Amino acid sequence: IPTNFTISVTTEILPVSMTKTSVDCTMYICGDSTECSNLLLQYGSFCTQLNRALTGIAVEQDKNTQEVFAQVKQIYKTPPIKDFGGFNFSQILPDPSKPSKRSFIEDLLFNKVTNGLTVLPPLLTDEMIAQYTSALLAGTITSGWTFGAGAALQIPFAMQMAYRFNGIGVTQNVLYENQKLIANQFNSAIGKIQDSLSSALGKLQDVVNQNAQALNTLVKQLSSNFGAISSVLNDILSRLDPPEAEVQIDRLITGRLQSLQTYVTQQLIRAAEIRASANLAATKMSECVLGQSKRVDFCGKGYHLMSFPQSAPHGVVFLHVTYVPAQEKNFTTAPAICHDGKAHFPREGVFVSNGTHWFVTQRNFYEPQIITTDNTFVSGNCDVVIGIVNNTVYDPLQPELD
Amino acid sequence: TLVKQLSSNFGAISSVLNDILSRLDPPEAEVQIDRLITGRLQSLQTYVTQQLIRAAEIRASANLAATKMSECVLGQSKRVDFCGKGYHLMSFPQSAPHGVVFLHVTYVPAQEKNFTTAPAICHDGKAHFPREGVFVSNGTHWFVTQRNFYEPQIITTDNTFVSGNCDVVIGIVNNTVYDPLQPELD
Amino acid sequence: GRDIADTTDAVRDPQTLEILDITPCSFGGVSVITPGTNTSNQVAVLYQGVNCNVFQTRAGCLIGAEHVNNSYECDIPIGAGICASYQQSVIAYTMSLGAENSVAYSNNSIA
Ligand SMILES: *[C@@H]1O[C@H](CO)[C@@H](O)[C@H](O)[C@H]1NC(C)=O
Ligand SMILES: *[C@@H]1O[C@H](CO)[C@@H](O)[C@H](O)[C@H]1NC(C)=O
Ligand SMILES: *[C@@H]1O[C@H](CO)[C@@H](O)[C@H](O)[C@H]1NC(C)=O
Ligand SMILES: *[C@@H]1O[C@H](CO)[C@@H](O)[C@H](O)[C@H]1NC(C)=O
Ligand SMILES: *[C@@H]1O[C@H](CO)[C@@H](O)[C@H](O)[C@H]1NC(C)=O
Ligand SMILES: *[C@@H]1O[C@H](CO)[C@@H](O)[C@H](O)[C@H]1NC(C)=O
Ligand SMILES: *[C@@H]1O[C@H](CO)[C@@H](O)[C@H](O)[C@H]1NC(C)=O
Ligand SMILES: *[C@@H]1O[C@H](CO)[C@@H](O)[C@H](O)[C@H]1NC(C)=O
Ligand SMILES: *[C@@H]1O[C@H](CO)[C@@H](O)[C@H](O)[C@H]1NC(C)=O
Ligand SMILES: *[C@@H]1O[C@H](CO)[C@@H](O)[C@H](O)[C@H]1NC(C)=O
Ligand SMILES: *[C@@H]1O[C@H](CO)[C@@H](O)[C@H](O)[C@H]1NC(C)=O
Ligand SMILES: *[C@@H]1O[C@H](CO)[C@@H](O)[C@H](O)[C@H]1NC(C)=O
């Protein structure tokens, strides 16, 4: 049975979006030349299909950034006074004396991450995303899971933490008798995360590099002659008469169309992958943040207590605080105890003996208590159960009757 | 788009094979035919790739819908904001062309009210904690109520378990717990 | 000179040797904002990434719409935090995320 606990806070990095880019088909395939545009007219509808395919991804990204963050109806605000029972949320809460409303951890995360081509701006400004995140933090800190469904109801933070301990299966008095130690451990964990981040966001960095490499390959593909005499339309036009020049021109057109189609296809695959990541992030925000999860390893290693969201460039960062048992101590156990010919079973907990006396205690923590009829319910005679030990069960009413 | 792709020259003199065959001798007409067949093959490949990419999204949505059928319909779900908004109760499936419609039923509280609360009550030097519920104050008296609904009950030993002593708890109040045994033992 | 993409960013004048930078002329895209055919047929034309009722935005130059300081819920999103809606001239505004609520929190208050 464990006899102690430790509070641990970890991080999770999930990308939710990618840069929106659009490439004009006519400009890339053909330079500013009337003759070149005429040849491309035969290859009907390809340019329109490619432009529509890119526009689909462009709008899907703005859809992705919406559902993960915009899950609150009213922008909540934390009270000016800071009385959270010894818990220090200064690091994650927004800092007013800064050009933006981003917190310290968000600032560190931002600092860590570093021919007819157009890059469209994202629809949500970073300040709006920071405002959404601050709303989520304020709601979680003050209300709890109540603001998740049916308006916000204020609760003192200590009582909310007691409810979460009750949720994970530990009695609530454990919190009230050990509040200071838990506050210190939580503060230390937050400090350690702050230290660790300053000294990696590998997940978010890969997408930027991949997109940049794809664009660079598109730009490089122009210099190839694709089996023609030269790689520039203007030289081909002057060097040869139109009837012989047209074959070189169509060779170049075919090559450039092939390169553009390859780029579009790989972009579609990458967009699908990013969509999957965004859906996972949205589910995590719904369940881990706006509630307490019973799913194992979904919201961090160990028993889950709560989560705090943060904002990173083209992604979201989750901080999962959990409960981890420790300080194991060995014991001896029995399935049931029968007194006066009738078996007794625990209402909740275990029968445990240090070697001389028998007690009943809860499973996740060592809180020995004397055996009483208030802690047990009878089922029958001793015969049916195997391993049933002999011990006495105290009666509370009898001495008072005396 | 596939049907319209058939009427494009793709570099040939005409978009109809019969027109090309009559006007030109076979040795020269074969090149014109080859251009057209290459173009049409390219269009067909593009169509097939697009259909595969769409089928992936459709099957992903089908898997999500199947998960919602088993969890929301066949049982009660604890996952928040998975089956509707609010505390989920039950769902009824409906059929739609190439799709399915769920009618989620939820429970949403309303008409909140202020109250004063205390973690525990100190009586006779021993702290009492509520087994299930909250301590709330009318403003002159103390009651224990369930969290989601307001149903005040008088504080008794049958409602509160005792653990520890008065000193440890940070915020504690003084009140009296009524013991049902004493009035009967009169 | 050239850059990483191998495009000639700079040249030198053969006479009176001087370094000259080359920048392409502004190309972009045109978008049309309309409130619907049944409603009054007034549109606004937005030029993507072009520097010019002319209102300059981060997304581009906007013609045919009047700027207003008031904030409303987003409709017909232009981009980069600007949403334009019809109220007779089309108006462009900075969208408001939501209503501002300050929940009253005390260490001994519950609801
Ligand atoms: C539990 O762990 C804390 C922190 O290491 C320590 O201070 C304490 O003495 C341990 N034991 C108990 C019974 O709390
Ligand atoms: C929270 O921590 C920061 C940095 O460790 C410190 O400056 C601040 O005073 C702390 N807040 C409280 C209430 O102790
Ligand atoms: C077991 O616990 C009881 C209760 O305090 C104590 O009297 C007894 O000595 C303990 N036995 C051993 C072997 O420590
Ligand atoms: C546990 O196993 C040992 C070894 O077989 C056996 O002697 C003992 O009776 C077992 N105890 C119970 C309670 O089954
Ligand atoms: C438990 O008590 C019963 C009462 O008669 C007795 O028969 C049995 O042998 C006892 N078992 C042990 C292990 O002492
Ligand atoms: C009850 O709470 C609301 C918070 O919306 C507050 O405005 C009101 O003043 C409170 N009433 C009392 C009597 O404290
Ligand atoms: C509740 O408080 C009011 C005064 O605020 C008092 O008149 C009333 O009797 C109290 N009710 C109970 C059941 O204590
Ligand atoms: C609640 O806050 C008030 C004002 O800061 C303070 O006087 C009181 O002692 C606090 N109560 C607890 C239980 O900390
Ligand atoms: C409760 O009663 C004790 C003993 O009379 C007293 O010391 C204390 O100040 C009272 N107030 C509290 C803590 O509720
Ligand atoms: C270029 O030619 C003009 C013609 O008079 C002359 O004045 C100038 O010095 C020349 N510059 C160089 C660099 O040769
Ligand atoms: C335009 O608005 C009118 C009036 O509400 C309505 O009757 C009509 O159907 C609308 N037309 C369209 C195309 O929505
Ligand atoms: C547009 O051009 C004017 C004139 O040079 C300049 O002052 C302004 O800063 C430019 N705007 C942008 C967004 O570059």
Residue numbers in the entry:
A (entry chain C): 714 to 827, 856 to 940, 944 to 1146
B (entry chain B): 961 to 1146
C (entry chain B): 566 to 617, 641 to 675, 690 to 713
What does the paper say about this structure?
The SARS-CoV-2 spike glycoprotein is the major surface antigen of the virus. Its function is to bind the host receptor ACE2 and mediate the subsequent membrane fusion required for cell entry. Here we have examined the structures and receptor-binding properties of spikes of the B.1.1.7 variant first described in Kent, United Kingdom (now termed Alpha)10,16–19 and the B.1.351 variant first described in South Africa (now termed Beta). Recently emerging variants of SARS-CoV-2 have acquired other substitutions in the spike including a number located at the monomer-monomer interfaces, at the receptor-binding site, and near the furin-cleavage site.
Similarly, we also show that the Y453F substitution in the RBD of mink spike, a structure of which we also report here, only increases affinity for human ACE2 if residue 614 is a glycine but not if it is an aspartic acid.
